[PDB]
Amino acid sequence: AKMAFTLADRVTEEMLADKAALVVEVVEENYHAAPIVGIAVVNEHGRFFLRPETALADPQFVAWLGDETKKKSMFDSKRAAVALKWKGIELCGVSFDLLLAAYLLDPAQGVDDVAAAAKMKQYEAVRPDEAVYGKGAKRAVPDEPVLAEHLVRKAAAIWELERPFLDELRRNEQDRLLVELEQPLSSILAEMEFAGVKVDTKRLEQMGKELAEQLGTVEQRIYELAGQEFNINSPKQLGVILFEKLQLPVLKKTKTGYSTSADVLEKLAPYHEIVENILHYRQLGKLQSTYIEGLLKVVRPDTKKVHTIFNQALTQTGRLSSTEPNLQNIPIRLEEGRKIRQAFVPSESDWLIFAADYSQIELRVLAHIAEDDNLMEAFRRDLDIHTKTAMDIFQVSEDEVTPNMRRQAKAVNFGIVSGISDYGLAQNLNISRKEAAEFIERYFESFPGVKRYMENIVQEAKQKGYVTTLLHRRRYLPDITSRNFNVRSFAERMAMNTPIQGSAADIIKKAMIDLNARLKEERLQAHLLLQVHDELILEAPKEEMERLCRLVPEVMEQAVTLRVPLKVDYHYGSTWYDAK
DNA sequence: CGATCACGC
DNA sequence: GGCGTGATCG
Ligand SMILES: Cc1cn([C@H]2C[C@H](O)[C@@H](COP(=O)(O)OP(=O)(O)OP(=O)(O)O)O2)c(=O)[nH]c1=O
Ligand SMILES: OC[C@H]1O[C@@](CO)(O[C@H]2O[C@H](CO)[C@@H](O)[C@H](O)[C@H]2O)[C@@H](O)[C@@H]1O
Ligand SMILES: [Mg+2]
User: Superfamily for A361-504?
Assistant: First the structure.
């Protein structure tokens, strides 16, 4: 069965043809500054394996990699591009990324290696990466003969699969989504990840010191009030202390026992002194374990930067995710956690952090897609949509919607369109099921086009087998025709939500591409650091801030044209905290 | 490795 | 209600 190839000792001219499938293998999951273990090239002239020490120290190979006119087809080009950047080598000319192609054709497939993508087209002449490298503790690069055969088979699969994938993308009207949106975005994400974000490590260490002390204090107080020691970090052990020893009322249950969630503890606070201590301990512990220790573990000691990886081929709706570290979930809502953001600083002296965010983008997207006259008029008047909803469902004037009311209208605005029930909304708003049913009815009376959207998009999903977003991303929903009610219900909620969340994802991706082009045209030093779903974070010289204040919102506001305006709020400052 | 919890959008 | 990461338990 073996596949024929040349195990080359030196780079030859026929390896540098103007179209090739290229594999630049990085086996460590986190590819930042990781080793490249081998290279395979498949082109019109044959199949080749190259040792990295050789190829990457060859001026002609290096020049070929960087020549935009020499076209390469790859799988996970970002991984290769970033690992090359760490070696001071530029990769250009990537015209097809099989990972991004498979992701667009069906995100549910969970494609995370060439073999899985190949399976989508009945191509099985390549092994899964896990079969070759093993997993976890057993993980390891095999001897050269086995490694080279594997890389060549992956390159040969990419070579064969480009056309069928591109054909199906075209049938799906996703060809531009790949070539004009996702692939250009991949390069931008590569730059952002490689740039990293600088952190004030001394500040983090200091916070960590103060957290460890307070943690020790609250822990003893807790054991003192409980009349005993227990593992506070065990919801089960906690439940026993709270509901069996101290006999606090059981306000909520989970599947396997008593709930001890923050919301429940908040309701129990009045009942006993131990409760406030538990919340405090949990708050401190989250900051310490997840954020302080997590960030300090991954900061690069030479530059003080952290380098996330944006997974561009994971979420079912077309969002990015962020890992190791996750820079999309740094605290902000509560001041204590928000202080962590003080430790995220500009990479150079006399630079500043600039943050821009798409105010209520999901509801603006809903207004556009549903063509609800009331929702559209509200955004055209630049009303605060949560206050306007508060006004409609509670039947009050603007002047009398309290902050608590706005927070509630938020819950209604987030929940209804995404398929919340009367039961769940009642839980959310701490009112009766019947009370919540009345608000939902009033909501649909106020926003009838939204009701019509929910009905129509579910009907369409049932008819076509999938739902789509503004720029033609798709999500298949086979469960929407399940004879099982609960299973089907989940699918109906996905049908209503995906087009909204996914269109918002399309828009910000396009804005990132538009933004980078404008920044380059203007020769600004400003560059992107992070995306957090509906916001973009940049750093730049202080001397560029006035230009950015006009440029960034304009670019983001103009990324797409909807039936209502896109609104962008922006702030800058000396740290991410201050960009508020 | 599923549950629970807590953080973001 | 939707989409994520990850700490921690058992
Ligand atoms: C906080 C929160 C956000 N989200 C999603 C939907 C939100 O529109 C999006 C952004 O969060 P928010 O910025 O809090 O929502 P918003 O922009 O609509 O309202 P506000 O003017 O008060 O900022 O995150 C939820 O789905 N559930 C939630 O509880
Ligand atoms: O390089 C990211 C890219 O690779 C995949 C697997 O093909 O994910 C791998 O890398 C991630 C980033 O380090 C890890 O979180 C993940 O566990 C690992 O499998 C794709 O999922 C991703 O798009
Ligand atoms: Mg907002």
Answer: 5' to 3' exonuclease, C-terminal subdomain (1.10.150.20)
* Under 8 Å between Cβ of A8 and A50: yes
Nearest-angstrom CA–CA distance, A502 and A240: 42
- For C5, nearest residue by CA–C1' is A326
Strands annotated E in A75-126:
94-97
Protein-proximal nucleotides of chain B (any atom < 7 Å from a CB): 3-9
Give the Å distances, CA to CA, from A147 to A5, A27, A49, A375, A468. Answer: 12, 11, 9, 58, 40
Q: How was this structure determined?
A: X-ray
Does ligand 1 lie within 6 Å of residue A544's CB atom?
no
Q: Residue A227: what are its φ and ψ, rounded to 5°?
A: 70, 15
Q: Is the CB of A326 under 6 A from ligand 1?
A: no
| Cα distances (Å, whole numbers) of residue A102 to A166, A316, A328, A426 | 10, 12, 25, 40
Q: Are strands A19-25 and A71-74 parallel, antiparallel or unpaired?
A: parallel
Q: Among A328, A334, A389, A410, which is best to mutate for testing ligand 1, by the most ligand atoms less than 8 A from CB?
A: A410
Q: CA(A418)–C1'(B8) in Å?
A: 18
CATH architecture of A1-194: 2-Layer Sandwich (3.30)
